[PDB]
Amino acid sequence: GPPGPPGPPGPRGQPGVLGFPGPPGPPG
Amino acid sequence: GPPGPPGPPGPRGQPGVLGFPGPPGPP
Amino acid sequence: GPPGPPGPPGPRGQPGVLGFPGPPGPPG
Amino acid sequence: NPAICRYPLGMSGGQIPDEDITASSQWSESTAAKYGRLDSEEGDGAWCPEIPVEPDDLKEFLQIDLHTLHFITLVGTQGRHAGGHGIEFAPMYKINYSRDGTRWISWRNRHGKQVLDGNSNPYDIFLKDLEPPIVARFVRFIPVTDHSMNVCMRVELYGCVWL
Structure with missing residues (x-):
């Protein structure tokens, strides 16, 4: 018999990493 | 035939957004 | 019939969380 | 005694399971209590409170939870x-x-000081001897600051089983 169709897409990837810390605040 | 196995997991998400500016310096 | 080939990679994961606020501003 | 009773109790090695590590709050699931293990880079790199720690509000x-009493x-x-871009620390x-999980004891050194000097950067491991040593089942690290700041911590306990 004919090969089955390609399998379905895999699971979604893992969450991305945290964004970088923000820049220093303004002068007091 | 049956479908092939599910594909591999996708790539990890993109880096999060940069944090907000810090608080003002001392009064 | 024989099984189909492996499916393609899944979708990219969700973005990472927002970063921490930056450090306190310097004396002004 | 402290010569033999100085072993890491499980934070870095995993002997202390995730379920036994909890916190007051968390910035994100990725910075939940279970990620506060010494030298770990899992998740977003450490346990981090949901809000900044204020100097006059140590909450x-x-x-x-070690389950059994430990020295x-x-x-x-x-x-x-965090791979080199994190800047947060206590x-x-x-x-x-x-011991019971109901009444909490505030550790005081020989001079009655409760505040321990901690890290000065986010990457170095900083060790502190406990004199007197403590006997406990539950141990809490309470971050202390002198100004509002977003802290994060990764920790380890050293000692041995009691009895």
């Missing part, structure tokens, strides 16, 4: 390295502990 904590002779802390901290 955050990272709690470890704790040293503690180690780090901030959040500059000071207090240690509260309990």
